Amino acid sequence: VKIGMAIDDLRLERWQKDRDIFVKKAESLGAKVFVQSANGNEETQMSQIENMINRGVDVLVIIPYNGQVLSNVVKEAKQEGIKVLAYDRMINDADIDFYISFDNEKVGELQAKALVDIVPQGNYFLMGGSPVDNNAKLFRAGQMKVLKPYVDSGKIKVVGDQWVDGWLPENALKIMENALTANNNKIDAVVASNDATAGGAIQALSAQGLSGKVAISGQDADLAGIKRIAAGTQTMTVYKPITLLANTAAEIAVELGNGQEPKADTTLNNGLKDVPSRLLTPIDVNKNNIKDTVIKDGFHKESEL
Numbered sequence: 659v660k661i662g663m664a665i666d667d668l669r670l671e672r673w674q675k676d677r678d679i680f681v682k683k684a685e686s687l688g689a690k691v692f693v694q695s696a697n698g699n700e701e702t703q704m705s706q707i708e709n710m711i712n713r714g715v716d717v718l719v720i721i722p723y724n725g726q727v728l729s730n731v732v733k734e735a736k737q738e739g740i741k742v743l744a745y746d747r748m749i750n751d752a753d754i755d756f757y758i759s760f761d762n763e764k765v766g767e768l769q770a771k772a773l774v775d776i777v778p779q780g781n782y783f784l785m786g787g788s789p790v791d792n793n794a795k796l797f798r799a800g801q802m803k804v805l806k807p808y809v810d811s812g813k814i815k816v817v818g819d820q821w822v823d824g825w826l827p828e829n830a831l832k833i834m835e836n837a838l839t840a841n842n843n844k845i846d847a848v849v850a851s852n853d854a855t856a857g858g859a860i861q862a863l864s865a866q867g868l869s870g871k872v873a874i875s876g877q878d879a880d881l882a883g884i885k886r887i888a889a890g891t892q893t894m895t896v897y898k899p900i901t902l903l904a905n906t907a908a909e910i911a912v913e914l915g916n917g918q919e920p921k922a923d924t925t926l927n928n929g930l931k932d933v934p935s936r937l938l939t940p941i942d943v944n945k946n947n948i949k950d951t952v953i954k955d956g957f958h959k960e961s962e963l
């Protein structure tokens with residue numbers, strides 16, 4: 659099997675581990691991988707994809723920079739019998755064959771569940787991510803799925819709901835400060851949607867003497883987030899191991915090149931079709947499993963804690 663991998667952006671740390679695990683795993687399955695990076699550019703990506711189609715790849719793996727505008731290039735690929743796999747970000751209104759990501763709804767469920775595990779009754783502030791980030795709404799659906807029976811039954815009372823523009827720690831800091839002022843510090847848990855916003859909220863909580871007293875969730879397992887969890891000031895984070903995502907995408911890619919129809923958790927609509935999807939299970943990280951998750955995986959080093 660010939661794989662073309664069109665990564666939007668390899669100039670950052672973002673996708674580089676994904677490339678390397680994907681490449682080494684695909685090769686080990688008996689496949690050749692040609693990789694290009696669009697250096698953040700949407701027109702470079704169109705060209706590199708066209709380049710792949712014209713090299714005779716059997717499978718395209720695309721991490722899109724702008725997934726609203728690859729419809730023609732995908733159609734062109736399908737016309738040649740090439741399979742398209744959308745890696746991590748969905749490709750919209752395109753005739754793709756597969757989608758692999760972590761299950762973002764599950765990220766939300768994990769976040770809210772770790773919080774009702776310790777604060778089954780009390781005042782909750784909802785801190786969503788960017789209101790233009792579709793993933794932000796996904797985390798919030800998962801969070802609300804878990805909260806619903808507690809809200810409807812009066813055990814949990816929602817005392818604010820704000821979305822953090824740009825996921826900026828400093829916007830999250832202001833948001834939190836406003837929520838604390840408006841509730842005269844009576845906030846028992848904060849459903850923050852990532853580590854960076856949680857971190858800004860924690861700074862507001864710290865400045866009122868409430869650090870360690872208010873439950874707060876997160877996501878990404880940022881080093882600093884891992885440290886706050888060890889220190890008691892953040893409750894939990896959700897880890898999304900690259901090696902798992904990259905490993906599973908390679909196996910799907912190879913499967914797709916072999917006419918086979920790979921294992922899909924569900925079917926997401928991209929606004930043209932019901933795309934089969936593997937939505938990997940994300941990992942709850944708390945104070946007790948830091949070593950067994952993010953250290954073991956190599957994501958962070960013990961000497962760094």
Ligand SMILES: O[C@@H]1[C@@H](O)[C@H](O)OC[C@H]1O
Pocket residue numbers: 787791793794825851852853877878
């Ligand atoms: O991993 C998170 C990502 O999915 C979301 O889109 O933006 C914030 C990050 O914390």
